[PDB]
Amino acid sequence: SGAKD
Amino acid sequence: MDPSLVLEQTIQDVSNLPSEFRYLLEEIGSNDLKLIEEKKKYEQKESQIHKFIRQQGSIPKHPQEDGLDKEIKESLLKCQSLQREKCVLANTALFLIARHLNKLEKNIALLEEDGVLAPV
Amino acid sequence: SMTQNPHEVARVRNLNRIIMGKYEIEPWYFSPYPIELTDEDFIYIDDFTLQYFGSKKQYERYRKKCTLRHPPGNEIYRDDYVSFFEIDGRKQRTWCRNLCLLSKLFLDHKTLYYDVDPFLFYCMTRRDELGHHLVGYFSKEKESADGYNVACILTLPQYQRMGYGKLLIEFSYELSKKENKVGSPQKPLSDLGLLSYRAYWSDTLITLLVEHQKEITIDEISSMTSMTTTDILHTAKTLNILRYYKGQHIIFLNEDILDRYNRLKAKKRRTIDPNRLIWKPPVFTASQLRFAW
Amino acid sequence: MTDELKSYEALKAELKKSLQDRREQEDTFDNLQQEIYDKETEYFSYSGNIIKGFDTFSSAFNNNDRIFSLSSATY
Amino acid sequence: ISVKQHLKIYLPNDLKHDYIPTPDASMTWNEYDKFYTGSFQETTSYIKFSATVEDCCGTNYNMDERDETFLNEQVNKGSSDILTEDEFEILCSSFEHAIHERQPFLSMDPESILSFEELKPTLIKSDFNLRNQLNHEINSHKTHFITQFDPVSQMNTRPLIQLIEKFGSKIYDYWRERKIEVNGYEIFPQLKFERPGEKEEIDPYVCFRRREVRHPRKTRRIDILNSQRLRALHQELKNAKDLALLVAKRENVSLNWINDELKIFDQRVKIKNLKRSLNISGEDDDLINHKRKRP
């Protein structure tokens, strides 16, 4: 989540 | 169906429209300035042909009639393209507001088909 | 539509090779493009709408009818070099999705679990006779409580090593300076982006410290550059600026550092001009900070 | 050669009709130009417009804000 | 030149100086100049834009290589009347919309897809309505209504209502077979989405999930407050559309004014050349500009 992973 | 949801949706979709009308209308005015200055460039050359006719008629030929007619036609045709561009600009401003108006009027009709929406 | 094949084979395959506009690019990571396109020789990416195509004939019919020539949004910055477009993910759902599908091909930690609604996409373009050509972008949370001024940042592979990565970073902090807020990129940075950020942090720091003359404070550095106090002290540790000599903390701008300062002043690298940034921070309500319904 | 005379009679009648259209279009143009100016005053003088913005749910109308009339160099 | 065994490396995969991988230099495309034709004039002010991609893409349907061979080697092989590629897409785009409305669950029984004769009534009932409405309000009544989001190649395309009578039965029977091959699903590759209310986690191709859900107010009372402000916004959009219409009218009559001037001038030059050939005297009042009153 948060546009990151 | 919720009027506050329709209101939020309508506001967000129309939020940039005031900024868009200015961007379009000032592109019409900048092209209307180019139009008027180009009017003087052919209305003067057309005044030379008409002044010759006002004294001698149409049967006598203007000393540079074939030379000016090529310049009048060229200056008149470029004015047409400048005017067509202003039409397209004005049509887009009309298209955007009309489409958003229809979207809102369709939602208002749906809210009125339920009990959600209060009268005028 | 809800029309999807339940017996369709789901196999992870990266794209063979994409053709975005005039350039032929090779994807590095997997992006969830349609499963039918993952087994094609070439995929065509329109460099205006970022739409994907597996059939060359469809890409022809699309190009002959597409009238869009620039990122669908307001132009908030333009100099004689590049332009910047601000695009809302909730307003331009189709376009922003295509940008994320494209970006996932080259970003390893980028994720497409959720939609593009909660993100603001700032896209840097190069104007041409054909129109504005997207060269790089950086995404930004609408109202980041964590102080993240950059979510994902990417410079397209065909425009790499041209100083575009340094412009995205510099423009990102410029938006933070206009918002009167300190910022830091989202924590999992890539190898390429980490180097570009360490370069921006060190260069803008040495330029500030030399020209300041007056005594400076850590909190004041954060005010002028909109950098977080963590990024400032980490940059001060990467350099040998901060030394504890004779029972007190001081800043040391030695000659080796001043040599890089002199090179930077004579160098003619592209910079962001704040006077050409016509942009006021977007104001969202409580209803607007939700996914569209 | 009588055909050449008939063509001269057709262009004269057509040019009289084209001159009439030019006068009508020029005549309705002046009505629209004044119509735009009057509609700006009636509508722009909740308080959301195209001049300020529609999002009011959280300075005056000068003649410099008549963006519709200022879209014509004639005005 | 010591050789403790070293290895040379050429770089299809580059390096930049942990070490950092670097994309290779991108080759250019040959047909780029063939696909990308046009010119974008830069404006003095910063670009203001909010239309969506769908507004700028034209018709939904796009011909592939298979439709190209069918259009040329079947319908336009030796026919008297040729079917334009733009017109071929208009037919299929209307077919796709009709089935999506009447048979949303075609995948349940693909063989029972509607026939052409059964679908023809629905194809007639199918923003063309808004485009023609604005064209009447401007009182243009000339060809099409042109905006910025319209290419010039769409003007030479016959209307949909006539395309059904001329080529409808031949094209639909071909389009019908395509839907059968895909068992009622989408002919061309689509993105994989999460079904509303369901949750998917394993499938890698599921994109852009939206899990937020808005619940209705626990009341049957009328929202008086948010309905009055909606009516006020509606009124301001009506006033907005009135001024935009007047501006579109003003520029349209300015187009008819110059179209007369361009025609009057072309008529005045033909008369003068005919007057000198016929030696007709006078008659120049219409050939010279007079001065009338204008505010």
Short mmCIF file of N, CA and C in Angstrom, two decimals, chain C residues 1-6 11-13 19 21-25 28 30 32-36 44-47 49 52 55-63 65-70 72-75 78 85 91-95 97 112-117 127 129-133 157-158 160-161 191-192 276 278 290-293, chain E residues 16 18-24 26-29 31-32 34-40 42-54 56-59 61-65 68 85-86 89 107 148-151 153-154 184-186 188-193 196 200-201 203-214:
data_model
loop_
_atom_site.label_atom_id
_atom_site.label_comp_id
_atom_site.label_asym_id
_atom_site.label_seq_id
_atom_site.Cartn_x
_atom_site.Cartn_y
_atom_site.Cartn_z
N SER C 1 -16.93 -3.85 -18.18
CA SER C 1 -17.91 -4.92 -18.17
C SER C 1 -17.47 -6.06 -17.26
N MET C 2 -18.44 -6.86 -16.80
CA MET C 2 -18.16 -8.03 -15.97
C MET C 2 -17.95 -9.30 -16.80
N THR C 3 -17.48 -9.16 -18.04
CA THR C 3 -17.37 -10.27 -18.99
C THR C 3 -15.91 -10.73 -19.04
N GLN C 4 -15.57 -11.69 -18.19
CA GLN C 4 -14.21 -12.21 -18.12
C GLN C 4 -14.23 -13.73 -18.06
N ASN C 5 -13.30 -14.35 -18.78
CA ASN C 5 -13.26 -15.80 -18.90
C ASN C 5 -12.77 -16.44 -17.60
N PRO C 6 -13.57 -17.28 -16.94
CA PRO C 6 -13.10 -17.92 -15.71
C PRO C 6 -12.11 -19.04 -15.96
N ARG C 11 -0.90 -16.97 -16.37
CA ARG C 11 0.53 -17.26 -16.30
C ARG C 11 1.31 -15.95 -16.33
N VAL C 12 2.25 -15.80 -15.41
CA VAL C 12 3.04 -14.58 -15.29
C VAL C 12 4.08 -14.56 -16.41
N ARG C 13 3.95 -13.62 -17.34
CA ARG C 13 4.93 -13.44 -18.40
C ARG C 13 5.16 -11.96 -18.64
N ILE C 19 6.98 -0.69 -27.99
CA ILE C 19 7.33 0.39 -28.92
C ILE C 19 6.51 1.62 -28.53
N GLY C 21 5.79 5.22 -28.93
CA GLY C 21 6.07 6.33 -29.82
C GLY C 21 7.09 5.98 -30.88
N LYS C 22 8.27 6.60 -30.80
CA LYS C 22 9.33 6.35 -31.77
C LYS C 22 10.43 5.44 -31.23
N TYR C 23 10.39 5.10 -29.94
CA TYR C 23 11.45 4.34 -29.31
C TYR C 23 11.01 2.92 -28.99
N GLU C 24 11.97 1.99 -29.08
CA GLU C 24 11.77 0.57 -28.82
C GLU C 24 12.41 0.24 -27.48
N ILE C 25 11.59 -0.09 -26.49
CA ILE C 25 12.04 -0.30 -25.12
C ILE C 25 11.86 -1.76 -24.71
N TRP C 28 11.70 -4.40 -17.90
CA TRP C 28 12.49 -5.09 -16.88
C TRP C 28 11.65 -5.93 -15.93
N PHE C 30 7.48 -7.29 -14.44
CA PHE C 30 6.14 -7.69 -14.86
C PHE C 30 5.13 -6.58 -14.61
N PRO C 32 0.77 -6.01 -15.07
CA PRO C 32 -0.44 -6.78 -15.37
C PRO C 32 -1.20 -6.31 -16.61
N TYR C 33 -0.53 -6.28 -17.76
CA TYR C 33 -1.21 -6.04 -19.02
C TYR C 33 -2.10 -7.23 -19.36
N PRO C 34 -3.03 -7.07 -20.30
CA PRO C 34 -3.89 -8.19 -20.69
C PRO C 34 -3.09 -9.44 -21.02
N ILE C 35 -3.60 -10.59 -20.57
CA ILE C 35 -2.85 -11.84 -20.69
C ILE C 35 -2.60 -12.19 -22.14
N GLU C 36 -3.48 -11.76 -23.04
CA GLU C 36 -3.28 -12.05 -24.45
C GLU C 36 -2.09 -11.30 -25.02
N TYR C 44 2.54 -2.01 -28.86
CA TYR C 44 2.59 -0.60 -29.24
C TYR C 44 1.98 0.25 -28.13
N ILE C 45 2.75 1.22 -27.64
CA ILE C 45 2.30 2.15 -26.61
C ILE C 45 2.20 3.53 -27.24
N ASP C 46 0.99 4.06 -27.34
CA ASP C 46 0.81 5.43 -27.80
C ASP C 46 1.49 6.37 -26.81
N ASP C 47 2.38 7.23 -27.30
CA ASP C 47 3.13 8.09 -26.39
C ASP C 47 2.37 9.36 -26.02
N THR C 49 -1.52 8.92 -25.14
CA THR C 49 -2.54 8.38 -24.26
C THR C 49 -2.06 7.17 -23.48
N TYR C 52 -2.23 0.70 -24.81
CA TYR C 52 -1.50 -0.48 -25.24
C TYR C 52 -2.20 -1.17 -26.41
N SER C 55 -2.11 -5.42 -31.77
CA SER C 55 -2.31 -5.45 -33.21
C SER C 55 -1.83 -4.14 -33.82
N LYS C 56 -0.97 -4.24 -34.83
CA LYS C 56 -0.45 -3.04 -35.49
C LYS C 56 -1.55 -2.31 -36.23
N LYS C 57 -2.53 -3.04 -36.76
CA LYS C 57 -3.60 -2.40 -37.52
C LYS C 57 -4.48 -1.57 -36.59
N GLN C 58 -4.76 -2.09 -35.39
CA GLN C 58 -5.52 -1.32 -34.41
C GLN C 58 -4.76 -0.09 -33.97
N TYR C 59 -3.44 -0.21 -33.82
CA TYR C 59 -2.62 0.94 -33.47
C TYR C 59 -2.63 1.98 -34.58
N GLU C 60 -2.81 1.54 -35.83
CA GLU C 60 -2.94 2.47 -36.94
C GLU C 60 -4.28 3.19 -36.88
N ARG C 61 -5.37 2.44 -36.71
CA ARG C 61 -6.69 3.05 -36.65
C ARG C 61 -6.83 3.97 -35.45
N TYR C 62 -6.17 3.63 -34.35
CA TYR C 62 -6.22 4.45 -33.16
C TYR C 62 -5.48 5.76 -33.38
N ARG C 63 -4.27 5.66 -33.95
CA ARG C 63 -3.45 6.84 -34.20
C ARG C 63 -4.12 7.79 -35.18
N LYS C 65 -7.19 8.42 -35.44
CA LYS C 65 -8.37 9.02 -34.86
C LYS C 65 -8.12 9.74 -33.55
N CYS C 66 -7.01 9.47 -32.88
CA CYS C 66 -6.71 10.08 -31.59
C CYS C 66 -6.29 11.53 -31.76
N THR C 67 -6.99 12.43 -31.07
CA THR C 67 -6.73 13.86 -31.16
C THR C 67 -5.96 14.41 -29.98
N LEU C 68 -5.68 13.58 -28.98
CA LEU C 68 -4.92 14.01 -27.81
C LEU C 68 -3.44 14.09 -28.15
N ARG C 69 -2.80 15.20 -27.78
CA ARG C 69 -1.39 15.41 -28.06
C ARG C 69 -0.61 15.87 -26.83
N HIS C 70 -1.20 15.78 -25.63
CA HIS C 70 -0.51 16.19 -24.41
C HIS C 70 -1.23 15.57 -23.22
N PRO C 72 -3.52 14.77 -20.32
CA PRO C 72 -4.82 15.39 -20.03
C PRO C 72 -4.89 16.09 -18.69
N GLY C 73 -4.40 17.33 -18.63
CA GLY C 73 -4.45 18.08 -17.39
C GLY C 73 -3.97 19.49 -17.64
N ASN C 74 -3.88 20.26 -16.55
CA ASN C 74 -3.44 21.64 -16.65
C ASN C 74 -1.92 21.73 -16.66
N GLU C 75 -1.40 22.59 -17.52
CA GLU C 75 0.03 22.85 -17.60
C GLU C 75 0.42 23.81 -16.48
N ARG C 78 6.22 25.56 -17.57
CA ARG C 78 6.74 25.46 -18.94
C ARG C 78 7.87 26.45 -19.14
N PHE C 85 2.78 18.74 -16.39
CA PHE C 85 1.33 18.62 -16.37
C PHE C 85 0.89 17.98 -15.06
N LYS C 91 -9.82 11.97 -11.81
CA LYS C 91 -10.41 12.61 -12.98
C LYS C 91 -10.00 11.92 -14.28
N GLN C 92 -8.73 11.53 -14.41
CA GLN C 92 -8.22 10.88 -15.61
C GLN C 92 -7.89 9.42 -15.29
N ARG C 93 -8.94 8.65 -14.97
CA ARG C 93 -8.74 7.26 -14.57
C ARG C 93 -8.11 6.45 -15.69
N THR C 94 -8.65 6.57 -16.90
CA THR C 94 -8.13 5.80 -18.03
C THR C 94 -6.66 6.12 -18.29
N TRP C 95 -6.31 7.40 -18.34
CA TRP C 95 -4.94 7.79 -18.65
C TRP C 95 -3.98 7.38 -17.55
N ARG C 97 -4.26 5.01 -15.35
CA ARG C 97 -4.07 3.56 -15.31
C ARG C 97 -3.03 3.12 -16.33
N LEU C 112 0.00 -2.17 -8.05
CA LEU C 112 -1.27 -1.81 -8.65
C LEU C 112 -2.43 -2.53 -7.97
N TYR C 113 -2.32 -2.72 -6.65
CA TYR C 113 -3.43 -3.32 -5.91
C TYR C 113 -4.66 -2.43 -5.96
N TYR C 114 -4.49 -1.16 -5.61
CA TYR C 114 -5.57 -0.19 -5.58
C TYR C 114 -5.59 0.64 -6.86
N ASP C 115 -6.65 1.43 -7.01
CA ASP C 115 -6.83 2.26 -8.18
C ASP C 115 -5.97 3.52 -8.07
N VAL C 116 -6.00 4.35 -9.11
CA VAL C 116 -5.15 5.53 -9.19
C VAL C 116 -5.84 6.75 -8.58
N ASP C 117 -7.02 6.54 -7.98
CA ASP C 117 -7.76 7.67 -7.42
C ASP C 117 -7.00 8.48 -6.39
N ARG C 127 7.99 19.49 -25.41
CA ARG C 127 7.14 19.93 -26.50
C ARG C 127 7.86 19.75 -27.83
N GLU C 129 7.03 19.45 -32.48
CA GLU C 129 6.11 19.85 -33.54
C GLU C 129 4.86 18.98 -33.53
N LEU C 130 4.98 17.75 -33.03
CA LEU C 130 3.84 16.86 -32.90
C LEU C 130 3.03 17.14 -31.65
N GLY C 131 3.69 17.56 -30.58
CA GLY C 131 3.03 17.86 -29.32
C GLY C 131 3.97 17.58 -28.16
N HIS C 132 3.37 17.47 -26.98
CA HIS C 132 4.11 17.20 -25.75
C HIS C 132 4.40 15.70 -25.63
N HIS C 133 5.67 15.36 -25.47
CA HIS C 133 6.11 13.97 -25.35
C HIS C 133 6.50 13.68 -23.91
N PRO C 157 13.07 4.90 -19.97
CA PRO C 157 14.39 4.40 -20.37
C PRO C 157 14.96 5.05 -21.62
N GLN C 158 14.11 5.47 -22.56
CA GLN C 158 14.62 6.08 -23.77
C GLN C 158 15.04 7.53 -23.57
N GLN C 160 16.84 8.36 -20.61
CA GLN C 160 17.71 8.25 -19.46
C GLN C 160 19.03 8.96 -19.72
N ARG C 161 19.73 9.28 -18.62
CA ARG C 161 21.06 9.90 -18.68
C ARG C 161 21.04 11.20 -19.48
N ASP C 191 17.56 1.47 -6.94
CA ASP C 191 18.98 1.80 -7.04
C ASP C 191 19.21 3.06 -7.86
N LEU C 192 18.51 3.19 -8.99
CA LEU C 192 18.69 4.36 -9.84
C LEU C 192 18.18 5.62 -9.16
N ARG C 276 8.37 30.36 -13.30
CA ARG C 276 7.54 29.78 -14.34
C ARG C 276 6.58 28.73 -13.79
N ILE C 278 3.36 28.35 -12.27
CA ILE C 278 2.05 28.94 -12.00
C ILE C 278 1.18 27.81 -11.45
N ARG C 290 -11.92 10.54 -1.15
CA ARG C 290 -12.41 9.17 -1.15
C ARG C 290 -12.38 8.64 -2.57
N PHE C 291 -12.53 7.33 -2.70
CA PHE C 291 -12.63 6.73 -4.03
C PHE C 291 -13.98 7.08 -4.65
N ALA C 292 -13.97 7.35 -5.95
CA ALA C 292 -15.17 7.79 -6.64
C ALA C 292 -16.28 6.74 -6.56
N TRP C 293 -17.51 7.22 -6.47
CA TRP C 293 -18.67 6.34 -6.37
C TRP C 293 -19.77 6.77 -7.33
N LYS E 16 26.26 1.40 -14.76
CA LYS E 16 26.45 2.84 -14.56
C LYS E 16 27.31 3.10 -13.33
N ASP E 18 26.86 -0.58 -4.14
CA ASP E 18 26.23 -1.52 -5.06
C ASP E 18 26.25 -1.00 -6.49
N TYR E 19 26.33 -1.92 -7.45
CA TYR E 19 26.29 -1.56 -8.86
C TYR E 19 24.84 -1.37 -9.29
N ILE E 20 24.64 -0.56 -10.33
CA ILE E 20 23.30 -0.20 -10.76
C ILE E 20 23.08 -0.62 -12.21
N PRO E 21 22.06 -1.42 -12.49
CA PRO E 21 21.75 -1.80 -13.88
C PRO E 21 21.20 -0.61 -14.66
N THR E 22 21.49 -0.59 -15.96
CA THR E 22 21.08 0.54 -16.79
C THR E 22 20.45 0.07 -18.09
N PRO E 23 19.27 0.58 -18.44
CA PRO E 23 18.64 0.21 -19.72
C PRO E 23 19.53 0.58 -20.90
N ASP E 24 19.44 -0.22 -21.96
CA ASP E 24 20.24 0.04 -23.14
C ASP E 24 19.66 1.21 -23.93
N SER E 26 17.78 3.11 -26.68
CA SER E 26 16.57 2.71 -27.37
C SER E 26 16.67 3.01 -28.86
N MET E 27 16.44 1.98 -29.68
CA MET E 27 16.43 2.14 -31.13
C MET E 27 15.17 2.89 -31.57
N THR E 28 15.25 3.53 -32.72
CA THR E 28 14.13 4.29 -33.25
C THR E 28 13.26 3.42 -34.15
N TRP E 29 12.03 3.88 -34.37
CA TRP E 29 11.02 3.15 -35.12
C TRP E 29 10.93 3.68 -36.55
N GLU E 31 8.38 3.23 -38.98
CA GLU E 31 7.09 3.77 -39.40
C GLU E 31 6.59 4.89 -38.50
N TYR E 32 7.46 5.43 -37.64
CA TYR E 32 7.04 6.47 -36.71
C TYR E 32 6.46 7.67 -37.45
N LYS E 34 4.97 7.64 -40.20
CA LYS E 34 3.73 7.25 -40.86
C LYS E 34 2.56 7.29 -39.90
N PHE E 35 2.78 6.89 -38.64
CA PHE E 35 1.70 6.88 -37.67
C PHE E 35 1.47 8.26 -37.05
N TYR E 36 2.55 9.00 -36.78
CA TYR E 36 2.48 10.26 -36.05
C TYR E 36 2.60 11.45 -37.00
N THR E 37 1.46 11.86 -37.56
CA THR E 37 1.38 12.98 -38.48
C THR E 37 0.50 14.07 -37.88
N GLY E 38 0.99 15.30 -37.89
CA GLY E 38 0.22 16.42 -37.38
C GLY E 38 1.13 17.50 -36.83
N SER E 39 0.50 18.56 -36.33
CA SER E 39 1.20 19.71 -35.77
C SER E 39 0.41 20.28 -34.60
N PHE E 40 1.10 20.57 -33.49
CA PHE E 40 0.50 21.16 -32.30
C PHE E 40 1.05 22.56 -32.08
N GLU E 42 1.74 25.79 -30.15
CA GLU E 42 1.84 26.19 -28.76
C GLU E 42 1.08 27.49 -28.51
N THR E 43 0.33 27.53 -27.41
CA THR E 43 -0.41 28.72 -27.02
C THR E 43 0.41 29.60 -26.08
N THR E 44 0.10 30.89 -26.08
CA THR E 44 0.83 31.84 -25.24
C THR E 44 0.67 31.52 -23.76
N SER E 45 -0.55 31.18 -23.34
CA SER E 45 -0.82 30.84 -21.96
C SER E 45 -0.60 29.34 -21.71
N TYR E 46 -0.57 28.98 -20.43
CA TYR E 46 -0.42 27.58 -20.06
C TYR E 46 -1.68 26.78 -20.40
N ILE E 47 -1.48 25.54 -20.86
CA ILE E 47 -2.58 24.71 -21.31
C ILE E 47 -3.54 24.41 -20.18
N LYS E 48 -4.83 24.62 -20.44
CA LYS E 48 -5.91 24.24 -19.53
C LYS E 48 -6.74 23.15 -20.20
N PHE E 49 -6.84 21.99 -19.56
CA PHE E 49 -7.46 20.83 -20.17
C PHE E 49 -8.00 19.91 -19.09
N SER E 50 -9.17 19.31 -19.36
CA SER E 50 -9.77 18.39 -18.41
C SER E 50 -10.56 17.27 -19.07
N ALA E 51 -10.61 17.19 -20.40
CA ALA E 51 -11.32 16.11 -21.07
C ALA E 51 -10.57 14.79 -20.90
N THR E 52 -11.32 13.70 -20.95
CA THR E 52 -10.76 12.37 -20.75
C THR E 52 -10.23 11.80 -22.06
N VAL E 53 -9.49 10.69 -21.93
CA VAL E 53 -8.94 10.02 -23.10
C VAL E 53 -10.06 9.54 -24.02
N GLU E 54 -11.14 9.02 -23.43
CA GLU E 54 -12.26 8.54 -24.24
C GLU E 54 -12.82 9.64 -25.13
N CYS E 56 -11.09 11.85 -26.62
CA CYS E 56 -10.14 12.14 -27.69
C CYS E 56 -9.75 10.93 -28.52
N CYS E 57 -10.42 9.79 -28.37
CA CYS E 57 -10.00 8.59 -29.09
C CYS E 57 -10.87 8.29 -30.29
N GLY E 58 -12.03 8.92 -30.38
CA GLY E 58 -12.91 8.63 -31.49
C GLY E 58 -13.76 7.42 -31.16
N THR E 59 -14.08 6.66 -32.20
CA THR E 59 -14.95 5.51 -32.07
C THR E 59 -14.30 4.39 -31.26
N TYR E 61 -14.57 1.04 -31.55
CA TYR E 61 -14.04 -0.11 -32.28
C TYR E 61 -12.82 0.28 -33.12
N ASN E 62 -11.85 -0.64 -33.18
CA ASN E 62 -10.66 -0.48 -33.99
C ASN E 62 -10.40 -1.74 -34.81
N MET E 63 -10.26 -1.58 -36.12
CA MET E 63 -10.03 -2.70 -37.02
C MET E 63 -8.65 -3.32 -36.79
N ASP E 64 -8.59 -4.65 -36.83
CA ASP E 64 -7.34 -5.37 -36.76
C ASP E 64 -6.97 -5.90 -38.15
N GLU E 65 -5.93 -6.73 -38.21
CA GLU E 65 -5.49 -7.28 -39.49
C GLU E 65 -6.56 -8.17 -40.11
N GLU E 68 -9.26 -6.14 -41.64
CA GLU E 68 -8.76 -5.48 -42.83
C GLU E 68 -8.89 -6.40 -44.05
N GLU E 85 -13.17 2.42 -43.82
CA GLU E 85 -12.69 1.82 -42.58
C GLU E 85 -13.32 2.50 -41.37
N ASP E 86 -13.49 3.82 -41.43
CA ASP E 86 -14.15 4.53 -40.34
C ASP E 86 -15.60 4.07 -40.21
N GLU E 89 -16.00 0.57 -38.62
CA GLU E 89 -15.91 0.60 -37.16
C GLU E 89 -17.19 1.12 -36.53
N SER E 107 -22.23 -14.70 -22.45
CA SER E 107 -21.30 -15.78 -22.17
C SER E 107 -22.00 -17.00 -21.60
N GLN E 148 -12.61 20.60 -30.82
CA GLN E 148 -11.19 20.30 -30.79
C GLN E 148 -10.93 18.80 -30.76
N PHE E 149 -11.88 18.03 -30.25
CA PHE E 149 -11.72 16.60 -30.07
C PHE E 149 -12.20 15.81 -31.28
N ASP E 150 -12.23 16.43 -32.45
CA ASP E 150 -12.73 15.79 -33.66
C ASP E 150 -11.71 15.88 -34.78
N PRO E 151 -11.27 14.75 -35.34
CA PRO E 151 -10.40 14.79 -36.52
C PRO E 151 -11.20 15.12 -37.77
N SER E 153 -11.05 13.65 -40.59
CA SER E 153 -11.35 12.47 -41.41
C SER E 153 -12.71 11.86 -41.10
N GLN E 154 -13.36 12.27 -40.01
CA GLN E 154 -14.65 11.72 -39.64
C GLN E 154 -15.81 12.41 -40.36
N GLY E 184 -18.88 -15.39 -26.37
CA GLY E 184 -19.68 -14.34 -25.80
C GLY E 184 -18.89 -13.32 -25.01
N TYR E 185 -17.60 -13.56 -24.78
CA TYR E 185 -16.76 -12.63 -24.04
C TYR E 185 -16.26 -11.52 -24.95
N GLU E 186 -15.23 -10.80 -24.52
CA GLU E 186 -14.75 -9.65 -25.27
C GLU E 186 -13.85 -10.09 -26.43
N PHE E 188 -11.60 -8.33 -28.15
CA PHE E 188 -10.22 -7.88 -28.04
C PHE E 188 -9.75 -7.84 -26.59
N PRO E 189 -8.46 -8.12 -26.35
CA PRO E 189 -7.94 -8.21 -24.98
C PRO E 189 -8.34 -7.07 -24.05
N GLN E 190 -8.93 -7.42 -22.91
CA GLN E 190 -9.33 -6.44 -21.91
C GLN E 190 -8.52 -6.64 -20.63
N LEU E 191 -8.54 -5.61 -19.79
CA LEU E 191 -7.89 -5.68 -18.49
C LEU E 191 -8.74 -6.51 -17.53
N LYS E 192 -8.07 -7.16 -16.58
CA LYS E 192 -8.73 -8.01 -15.61
C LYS E 192 -9.04 -7.22 -14.34
N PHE E 193 -10.32 -7.12 -14.00
CA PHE E 193 -10.76 -6.35 -12.84
C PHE E 193 -11.40 -7.24 -11.78
N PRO E 196 -17.26 -6.51 -8.17
CA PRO E 196 -17.74 -5.70 -7.04
C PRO E 196 -18.31 -6.56 -5.92
N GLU E 200 -10.23 -10.49 -4.46
CA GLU E 200 -9.25 -11.36 -5.11
C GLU E 200 -7.85 -10.94 -4.71
N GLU E 201 -7.00 -11.93 -4.40
CA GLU E 201 -5.67 -11.66 -3.88
C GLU E 201 -4.57 -12.41 -4.63
N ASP E 203 -4.66 -13.78 -8.02
CA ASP E 203 -4.50 -13.51 -9.44
C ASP E 203 -3.62 -12.28 -9.68
N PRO E 204 -2.51 -12.41 -10.41
CA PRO E 204 -1.62 -11.26 -10.61
C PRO E 204 -2.18 -10.24 -11.59
N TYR E 205 -3.14 -10.61 -12.42
CA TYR E 205 -3.64 -9.74 -13.47
C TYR E 205 -4.79 -8.84 -13.02
N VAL E 206 -5.24 -8.96 -11.78
CA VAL E 206 -6.29 -8.08 -11.26
C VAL E 206 -5.68 -6.74 -10.92
N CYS E 207 -6.25 -5.67 -11.47
CA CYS E 207 -5.68 -4.34 -11.33
C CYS E 207 -6.69 -3.36 -10.73
N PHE E 208 -6.14 -2.34 -10.06
CA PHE E 208 -6.86 -1.15 -9.61
C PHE E 208 -8.16 -1.49 -8.87
N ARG E 209 -8.01 -2.24 -7.78
CA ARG E 209 -9.16 -2.55 -6.93
C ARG E 209 -9.62 -1.30 -6.18
N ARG E 210 -10.94 -1.16 -6.06
CA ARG E 210 -11.55 -0.06 -5.31
C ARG E 210 -12.47 -0.65 -4.24
N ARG E 211 -11.99 -0.65 -2.99
CA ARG E 211 -12.66 -1.33 -1.89
C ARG E 211 -13.53 -0.40 -1.05
N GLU E 212 -13.47 0.91 -1.29
CA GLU E 212 -14.30 1.86 -0.56
C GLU E 212 -15.77 1.67 -0.91
N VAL E 213 -16.64 1.80 0.09
CA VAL E 213 -18.07 1.61 -0.08
C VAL E 213 -18.83 2.70 0.69
N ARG E 214 -19.71 3.41 -0.01
CA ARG E 214 -20.52 4.48 0.57
C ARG E 214 -21.88 3.92 0.99
#
